[PDB]
Structure formats: structure tokens, C-alpha cells
Paper text:
The enzyme pyridox(am)ine 5′‐phosphate oxidase (PNPO), whose catalytic action yields PLP, is one of the key players in this pathway. In humans, the different B6 vitamers, introduced with food, are interconverted through a salvage pathway which involves, besides kinases and phosphatases, the enzyme pyridoxine 5′‐phosphate (PNP)/pyridoxamine 5′‐phosphate (PMP) oxidase (PNPO) (di Salvo et al., 2011, 2012). This flavin mononucleotide (FMN)‐dependent enzyme, which produces PLP from PNP or PMP, plays an active role in vitamin B6 homeostasis. In both human and E. coli PNPO, PLP works as a regulator of its own production because it binds at an allosteric site of the enzyme, affecting the binding of substrate at the active site and inhibiting the catalytic activity (Barile et al., 2019, 2021). Mutations in the gene encoding PNPO are responsible for a severe form of neonatal epilepsy.
In order to further confirm the location of the PNPO allosteric site, we made several attempts to obtain the crystal structure of the protein‐PLP complex. On the basis of this previous experience, we carried out co‐crystallization attempts with either the wild type or the R225H variant of the human protein and PLP. We obtained crystals with both protein forms; however, PLP was detected only in the active site of the wild type protein, thus a clear indication about the location of the allosteric site was missing. A substantial part of the N‐terminal end is not visible in these structures: the electron density map starts from Glu46 in the R225H and from Ala47 in the wild type structure. Moreover, with respect to our structures, the conformation of the N‐terminal end in the previously published structure is different. The proteolytic cleavage of PNPO is not caused by the action of proteases during the purification, but it takes place in the bacterial cells, as evident from the western blot analysis of cell extracts. This observation indicates a marked flexibility of the N‐terminus, and could explain the fact that this region is missing in the electron density map of all the crystal structures solved so far. In the human PNPO, the coupling between the allosteric site and the active site is weaker, and PLP can bind simultaneously at the allosteric site and at the active site, forming a complex in which each subunit binds two PLP molecules. Although our x‐ray crystallography analyses were not successful in identifying the location of the PLP allosteric site, the results obtained with the site‐directed variants clearly show that the amino acid residues identified in the docking analysis are directly involved in the allosteric properties of the enzyme.
Numbering used by the authors:
A (entry chain A), B (entry chain A): 46 to 235, 243 to 261
Write the structure that this text describes.
Amino acid sequence: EAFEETHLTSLDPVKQFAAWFEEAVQCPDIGEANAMCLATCTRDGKPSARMLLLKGFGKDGFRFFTNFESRKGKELDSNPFASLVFYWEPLNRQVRVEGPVKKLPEEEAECYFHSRPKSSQIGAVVSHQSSVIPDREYLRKKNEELEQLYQDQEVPKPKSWGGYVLYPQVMEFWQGQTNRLHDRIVFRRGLGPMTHRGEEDWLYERLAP
Amino acid sequence: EAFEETHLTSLDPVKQFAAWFEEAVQCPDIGEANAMCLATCTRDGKPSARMLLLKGFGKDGFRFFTNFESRKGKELDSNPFASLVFYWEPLNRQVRVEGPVKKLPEEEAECYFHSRPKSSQIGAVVSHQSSVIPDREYLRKKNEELEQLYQDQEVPKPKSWGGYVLYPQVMEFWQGQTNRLHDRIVFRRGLGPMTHRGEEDWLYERLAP
Ligand SMILES: Cc1cc2nc3c(=O)[nH]c(=O)nc-3n(C[C@H](O)[C@H](O)[C@H](O)COP(=O)(O)O)c2cc1C
Ligand SMILES: Cc1cc2nc3c(=O)[nH]c(=O)nc-3n(C[C@H](O)[C@H](O)[C@H](O)COP(=O)(O)O)c2cc1C
Ligand SMILES: Cc1ncc(COP(=O)(O)O)c(C=O)c1O
Ligand SMILES: Cc1ncc(COP(=O)(O)O)c(C=O)c1O
Ligand code: NA
Ligand code: NA
């Protein structure tokens, strides 16, 4: 089926994302519909990328949780701009999001951290994410010891652990097609004869595949 | 099962990639084992990312084909550094590759271009990839007209279409595990007590998850 401007669910790309995300979640052949690739880079243009989970989305943007002292956390703190890719192979769909990133409030991060299974909370205390470690037994040992320490106790959120929110400035909706002639509808914040008004300060236009 | 330094297939990370890639290809639950996310960025640190197919790999690096006048092609030409992510959900594995990018020789690009189905060759001539276009009918029309033009003829490769090779400087092998305590073995080109010699100029070390 065609992916067409006149059959979008919404000209607010966050609501269009919600529509596609719901379809992904309802597809039995998709495991984690909220898996996404996060691209970051140094201020002088050395890029990096890794898989993350989306952990909430709405008008203020796309939220995710990590260690601020990891390789991505140092890049985001020095250069607060990122890009996201969602790829849903069984739907032949891709969503791209570009925007600036801010840290979430500490009390929000505390709340999310304590909502996680206790084993994941202890894992976050164990791991100085992306630091060099000697072997896997080092993690297994420290993890077992922290299980003793936190028996019947609350696990404190590490000072270095928290969340980010990416405020969308660009959102591309890609629908795959034959002959490599895909449908691309791209929203950007802001008129040319091929540029169209969406909701709020959004504009949208079609890009060649 | 543990992902362990003493049970790597190879201390040449390109051969370790080959081993994991073969397992991905042999997994019926993986559609395109060669799908990867490419992260690029401007010289002043504005990142971008999108799905691509890997189209060959070996000692000289990881090859892929695109339009040099696309958004990624302008970034790569201005700032010849990229990052790749392979994510194989059914194997709980991720591979990350960082390195500089060069353009492939024109005669190599010609050969690869003419190996593609004719409909994909014509699609590449139709599409000024990532340029703004008016509607999807614009592509359908131009594509049908180029089918007439190239009936029984060779489709010339566009001057703007070709390939890149990413020479690996960093390669991370990520194997997912319980409690978010994953196995990360990271090769980099080059000794600390946690740094180990691989093949050639490679070093490897374990990173905290
Ligand atoms: C599907 C998937 C989901 C992941 N989700 C997260 C996550 O939400 N946060 C996180 O810190 N790492 C997550 N990881 C691990 C990252 O890919 C990465 O190993 C880690 O964040 C360190 O990246 P860095 O060294 O670039 O900072 C996930 C990995 C996979 C494969
Ligand atoms: C699984 C998958 C594979 C793709 N493979 C390629 C490819 O090899 N080359 C390419 O130019 N675009 C490919 N695309 C399209 C890109 O995601 C993207 O739309 C296009 O390259 C333009 O990106 P840019 O605007 O950042 O330059 C693929 C898309 C998907 C979903
Ligand atoms: C637009 C575009 N160009 C090029 C490629 C490279 O793949 P192939 O040469 O098999 O068409 C792809 C892959 O899906 C693509 O979508
Ligand atoms: C290391 C790591 N931290 C954090 C997360 C975020 O997910 P959750 O809060 O559900 O553990 C993940 C997701 O897989 C992860 O691998
Ligand atoms: Na649905
Ligand atoms: Na195999």
C-alpha cells in the first residue's frame, strides 16, 4: 500500500509516530518495537551509535535512560544533539528523529529507576558502563555481593545514572516499496510549492528515496 | 551462554564478524542479516543515522552503496568518519564498527551497479536521493518513462551513485545477558593489565555493560 500525505493519521509527527508505534507493538513478529539506534557524536564530528530502548514519548520528545559516564553520556553532555532510528522489518518501516537532548529531572530518574526489576537496579550499580573491566567474573562477583548488601533494602540510584529527552526538530517516516522507490515524508520545525504546513510550527515535505 | 575472550573464533575482529554474520544468515528468524544502521555527522557535530545494507566486507573494511548527493553522502564527503550498528534480535547480539570512509573506485561501482536488478538501476536514475519532490506520482511517472528509454539498453550508472568502504578502527561485539550485565568485547587498533593483543595491530578489552 502507498504511504501518502492525504492518508497520514496526523500532521503532528509525534501522533503519526504513535500510530506507527501502535502498529509495531501489535505485530507479533516484532519483539521490542521500542528498540532504536541512538547516534551521538563529539563536537568535532566523530560519530558513534548503539541500540537503546525508548522509555516514553510525547509532546516534549523521546526519553531514554543510560549511564551519564558512558561513552554516549560524555558525548551527549559535551554535544547535546542526537539522532534516532526505529526499524520495523516486518512492516517495511523506518522512523528517524533528530533533535537536541536535555537531561531528565533527577526525581523523574529516581521514579523510573525504582520501577525497574531489582536485578536491573543492582546491575546499574555494578556497572561503570563502557569503562574497561578485567573479565566477566568481575561483574558476576560484584553483582552477587551487591545482592547481599541490598537484601530487603532499597537500591539507591547511582548519581551517574539517569535519563535524557530528545526534543524532535526533524521526523522522517519511511515506508519501503518496490524498485527501491520508497515513500519518505519528513517533518521539520519552521513557503516553497513542495513544502506543506503541519500542526503547530511543523512543516512536511516528500524526499526522493 | 557466556560470550568469553577464551572462546572467540578469532582475534582478528573482521573474522569474528564473519563468524557472527554466518550465524545471523543461518538464523531463519533474521530477514536481512546485512541490514545495519549507518551514523554520520557534520564536521561541527550534528549527527544523522539511517538503515543501509552491507554489500561486502573483508580486510579493507565494510562496503555500502548510496547516492553521493544524498544527505549521508554530503556528510561523508565533508566529514569522512562513520559508525555502523548490526542488531540481530533473535541472537541477542549487536556489532558496532567505527572508522574512516573512502569512496570505492568508479569501475567497482559500475560493476556492482550492473549486478543489481534492472528495476533498481532505473530507480537510482529516477531518484535524486533526499532531494525534495512534489508527490509519489512524480517518481512513478519518471520511473515508467525511464523504463521506455532503457528498453533493451544498458542503464548507465549515475555519476552521483557509488560506494564507500569503512576501514574498521573500532569493533565491538555485544552479547546480551540477564540483569542488563551484557558481554562486551571491543577491538581497537594500536600495555595496560586489562588490554590484550589481537591479530596485526589490534588490541581488545572488555567494557562494562
Ligand atoms: C536492544 C538493546 C537495548 C538497549 N537498551 C539500552 C538502554 O536503554 N540504555 C543503555 O544504557 N544501554 C542499552 N543497551 C546497551 C547499549 O547498546 C550500549 O552497549 C551501552 O549503552 C553503552 O553504549 P556506549 O558505550 O556507546 O555509551 C541496549 C542494547 C540493546 C541491544
Ligand atoms: C533495511 C534498509 C536498507 C536500506 N539500504 C540502503 C542502501 O543500501 N543504500 C541507500 O542509499 N539507502 C538504503 N536505504 C534507505 C536509507 O535508510 C535512507 O532512506 C536513504 O539512504 C537516504 O538517507 P539520507 O537522507 O540520510 O542520505 C535502506 C533502508 C532500509 C530500511
Ligand atoms: C534506496 C536504496 N538504494 C540502494 C540499496 C542497496 O541495496 P540493493 O543494491 O540490493 O538495491 C537499498 C537497499 O535496500 C536501498 O533501499
Ligand atoms: C544496559 C542497559 N541499561 C538500561 C536499559 C533500559 O531498559 P530497562 O530499564 O528495561 O532495563 C537497557 C535495555 O535493554 C540496557 O541494556
Ligand atoms: Na494495530
Ligand atoms: Na551457522
